[PDB]
Enzyme design. Sequence first.
Site, PDB file in Angstrom:
ATOM      1  N   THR A   1       0.846  -1.222   0.000  1.00 23.61           N
ATOM      2  CA  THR A   1       0.000   0.000   0.000  1.00 23.61           C
ATOM      3  C   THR A   1       0.870   1.256   0.000  1.00 23.61           C
ATOM      4  O   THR A   1       0.741   2.066  -0.918  1.00 23.61           O
ATOM      5  CB  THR A   1      -0.929   0.056   1.219  1.00 23.61           C
ATOM      6  OG1 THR A   1      -0.114  -0.091   2.376  1.00 23.61           O
ATOM      7  CG2 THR A   1      -1.979  -1.021   1.177  1.00 23.61           C
TER       8      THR A   1
ATOM      9  N   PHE B   1      -8.574   5.137   3.445  1.00 23.47           N
ATOM     10  CA  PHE B   1      -8.240   4.285   4.612  1.00 23.47           C
ATOM     11  C   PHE B   1      -9.482   3.560   5.111  1.00 23.47           C
ATOM     12  O   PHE B   1      -9.445   3.049   6.240  1.00 23.47           O
ATOM     13  CB  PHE B   1      -7.551   5.138   5.689  1.00 23.47           C
ATOM     14  CG  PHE B   1      -6.197   5.647   5.241  1.00 23.47           C
ATOM     15  CD1 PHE B   1      -5.089   4.821   5.184  1.00 23.47           C
ATOM     16  CD2 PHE B   1      -6.032   6.972   4.864  1.00 23.47           C
ATOM     17  CE1 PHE B   1      -3.846   5.298   4.779  1.00 23.47           C
ATOM     18  CE2 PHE B   1      -4.799   7.425   4.425  1.00 23.47           C
ATOM     19  CZ  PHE B   1      -3.701   6.604   4.407  1.00 23.47           C
TER      20      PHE B   1
ATOM     21  N   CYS C   1      -8.273   1.671   8.436  1.00 23.25           N
ATOM     22  CA  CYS C   1      -6.845   1.297   8.464  1.00 23.25           C
ATOM     23  C   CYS C   1      -6.235   1.638   9.827  1.00 23.25           C
ATOM     24  O   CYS C   1      -6.096   2.847  10.122  1.00 23.25           O
ATOM     25  CB  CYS C   1      -6.069   2.073   7.411  1.00 23.25           C
ATOM     26  SG  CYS C   1      -4.369   1.501   7.284  1.00 23.25           S
TER      27      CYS C   1
HETATM   28  C1  HEM Z   1      -1.293   4.216   1.996  1.00 29.29           C
HETATM   29  C2  HEM Z   1      -1.177   3.156   2.799  1.00 29.29           C
HETATM   30  C3  HEM Z   1      -2.367   2.366   3.199  1.00 29.29           C
HETATM   31  C4  HEM Z   1      -3.646   2.372   2.721  1.00 29.29           C
HETATM   32  C5  HEM Z   1      -4.172   3.151   1.538  1.00 29.29           C
HETATM   33  C6  HEM Z   1      -4.392   1.443   3.517  1.00 29.29           C
HETATM   34  C7  HEM Z   1      -5.751   1.202   3.289  1.00 29.29           C
HETATM   35  C8  HEM Z   1      -6.538   0.393   4.070  1.00 29.29           C
HETATM   36  C9  HEM Z   1      -7.922   0.258   3.934  1.00 29.29           C
HETATM   37  C10 HEM Z   1      -8.772   0.867   2.847  1.00 29.29           C
HETATM   38  C11 HEM Z   1      -8.344  -0.571   4.938  1.00 29.29           C
HETATM   39  C12 HEM Z   1      -9.773  -1.012   5.142  1.00 29.29           C
HETATM   40  C13 HEM Z   1      -9.992  -2.364   4.403  1.00 29.29           C
HETATM   41  C14 HEM Z   1     -11.397  -2.928   4.495  1.00 29.29           C
HETATM   42  O1  HEM Z   1     -12.375  -2.279   4.987  1.00 29.29           O
HETATM   43  O2  HEM Z   1     -11.547  -4.111   4.040  1.00 29.29           O
HETATM   44  C15 HEM Z   1      -7.159  -0.915   5.693  1.00 29.29           C
HETATM   45  C16 HEM Z   1      -7.169  -1.737   6.800  1.00 29.29           C
HETATM   46  C17 HEM Z   1      -6.024  -2.095   7.472  1.00 29.29           C
HETATM   47  N1  HEM Z   1      -4.769  -1.648   7.226  1.00 29.29           N
HETATM   48 FE1  HEM Z   1      -4.179  -0.395   5.917  1.00 29.29          FE
HETATM   49  N2  HEM Z   1      -3.600   0.911   4.459  1.00 29.29           N
HETATM   50  C18 HEM Z   1      -2.373   1.442   4.346  1.00 29.29           C
HETATM   51  C19 HEM Z   1      -1.229   1.181   5.095  1.00 29.29           C
HETATM   52  C20 HEM Z   1      -1.168   0.294   6.168  1.00 29.29           C
HETATM   53  C21 HEM Z   1      -0.066   0.038   7.004  1.00 29.29           C
HETATM   54  C22 HEM Z   1       1.293   0.673   6.911  1.00 29.29           C
HETATM   55  C23 HEM Z   1      -0.476  -0.899   7.941  1.00 29.29           C
HETATM   56  C24 HEM Z   1       0.242  -1.560   9.051  1.00 29.29           C
HETATM   57  C25 HEM Z   1       1.523  -1.408   9.300  1.00 29.29           C
HETATM   58  C26 HEM Z   1      -1.852  -1.218   7.624  1.00 29.29           C
HETATM   59  C27 HEM Z   1      -2.632  -2.101   8.308  1.00 29.29           C
HETATM   60  C28 HEM Z   1      -3.991  -2.248   8.127  1.00 29.29           C
HETATM   61  C29 HEM Z   1      -4.764  -3.120   9.027  1.00 29.29           C
HETATM   62  C30 HEM Z   1      -4.170  -3.982  10.118  1.00 29.29           C
HETATM   63  C31 HEM Z   1      -6.049  -3.007   8.628  1.00 29.29           C
HETATM   64  C32 HEM Z   1      -7.213  -3.715   9.258  1.00 29.29           C
HETATM   65  C33 HEM Z   1      -7.734  -2.823  10.429  1.00 29.29           C
HETATM   66  C34 HEM Z   1      -8.902  -3.440  11.177  1.00 29.29           C
HETATM   67  O3  HEM Z   1      -9.936  -3.829  10.539  1.00 29.29           O
HETATM   68  O4  HEM Z   1      -8.842  -3.574  12.440  1.00 29.29           O
HETATM   69  N3  HEM Z   1      -2.220  -0.475   6.565  1.00 29.29           N
HETATM   70  N4  HEM Z   1      -6.059  -0.313   5.149  1.00 29.29           N
END
Ligand code: HEM
Length: 454
Positions: free
Chosen positions: A267, A392, A399
């Site tokens: 990402t 996010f 996120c």
């Molecule tokens: C530009 C960078 C990033 C974008 C655009 C992004 C985007 C997203 C999005 C859209 C979701 C929601 C997904 C859903 O509803 O199915 C999500 C969830 C998540 N992202 Fe990211 N993410 C990014 C970077 C990161 C980083 C660096 C980490 C961890 C080091 C991370 C960990 C997670 C986790 C663990 C979730 C699940 C959260 C939960 O439901 O408790 N992401 N991300």
Amino acid sequence: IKEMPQPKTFGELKNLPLLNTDKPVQALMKIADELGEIFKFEAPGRVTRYLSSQRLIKEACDESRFDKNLSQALKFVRDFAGDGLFTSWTHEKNWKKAHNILLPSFSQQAMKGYHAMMVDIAVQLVQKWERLNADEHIEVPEDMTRLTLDTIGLCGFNYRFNSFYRDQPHPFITSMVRALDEAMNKLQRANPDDPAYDENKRQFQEDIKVMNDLVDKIIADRKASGEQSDDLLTHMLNGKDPETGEPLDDENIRYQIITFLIAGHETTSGLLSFALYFLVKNPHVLQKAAEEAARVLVDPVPSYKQVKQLKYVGMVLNEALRLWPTAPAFSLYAKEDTVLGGEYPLEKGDELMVLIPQLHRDKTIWGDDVEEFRPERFENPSAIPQHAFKPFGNGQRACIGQQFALHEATLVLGMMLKHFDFEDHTNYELDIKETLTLKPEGFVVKAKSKKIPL
Ligand code: HEM
Ligand SMILES: CCCCCCCN1CCC[C@H]1C(=O)N[C@@H](Cc1ccccc1)C(=O)O
């Protein structure tokens, strides 16, 4: 009460062959441009509805009416990411437990502790580019992926992937990338149980074993040594959920580590790549960002407080997320019967897909200049309608890494703009490769050093 449009069908396969492409998100975007803010998509045994308008998405983002669904993509990723935060249902005990334990490790406060590690990797990228010969160019997504994987490895579990020392990815990475490819490819198969897919299934199991064995040994090695580094692994070994009073078990810690490595690989690297693409296509914007970097980053090593003052660079990153949100969709289910937008009745359990790139193109929100790269759109968050901008995701299932990603991306983009001028020497034509996420493919630039010491 309107009837929903639906794209072209293939007999018994219904809409499924529309996703038989290496670019399915970009195909669904073209369908949304033709059919409008909502369309039905049917496959053998399943129906979803794709949402594109802020008018409908603001309703879908109501957590009293809709909860996170695991899309088919996430269910296939769950075969190696388990009940990690990203592939858990909100109702599974380990979602809220891991969420409560990990939230403090992902806060704006925690970023002060990760900053020095992020600078270590960012300095490696700047030195790589400083050391290129006159004739040479930069493979942008390749180098951004080297950086973002290495940063999460070091802040995740104090592990150096040493990606800037390699042409060939670390063996864990070759396995993770191949598992992600098999998960996303499994989506397109009308006939999945065919024997022509028997090799693929055998390889997936070896790749899962590789990821588990490195990650399980890292955990075991850390508990054995007893050392207390300020990384996510130390927080997960010592953390207790305030609700249950319980810690995460070793198997859940492994799913969280795999989840974080997937996120760092896929990402943040996409965001940096798209941000540099838009800056080299928009020289007036590149100039204003380079002026901020020069004025704020007055020390050889950026500080945490300086990164917080790169406001315009922050707006550049949001405007890249607007046009090409690298995580391009999320999925919701209706908690109860409900009516969407006073027109579309849904029953309990009905699924929705939010098509984030189309949401971000809603002309009723952004105006007629919606295809233009204009970071100044983000000067005042109070001037942006509710739920217009969702890179996010939404609500409690948004996120957890958002602060981490934006800190790292702001730091690195700020150092890139401080240290180099960029040339789009090939007049690069945007080609978006789809994995779990969206990235420029083949994007190359030339970087002329401003010869400012580190
Ligand atoms: C530009 C960078 C990033 C974008 C655009 C992004 C985007 C997203 C999005 C859209 C979701 C929601 C997904 C859903 O509803 O199915 C999500 C969830 C998540 N992202 Fe990211 N993410 C990014 C970077 C990161 C980083 C660096 C980490 C961890 C080091 C991370 C960990 C997670 C986790 C663990 C979730 C699940 C959260 C939960 O439901 O408790 N992401 N991300
Ligand atoms: C960052 C994570 C992004 C994940 C986004 C999903 C990315 N999919 C990749 C294909 C397009 C997009 C999507 O709409 N998939 C749905 C639709 C679907 C379900 C079953 C079989 C085939 C397709 C799904 O997976 O359920």
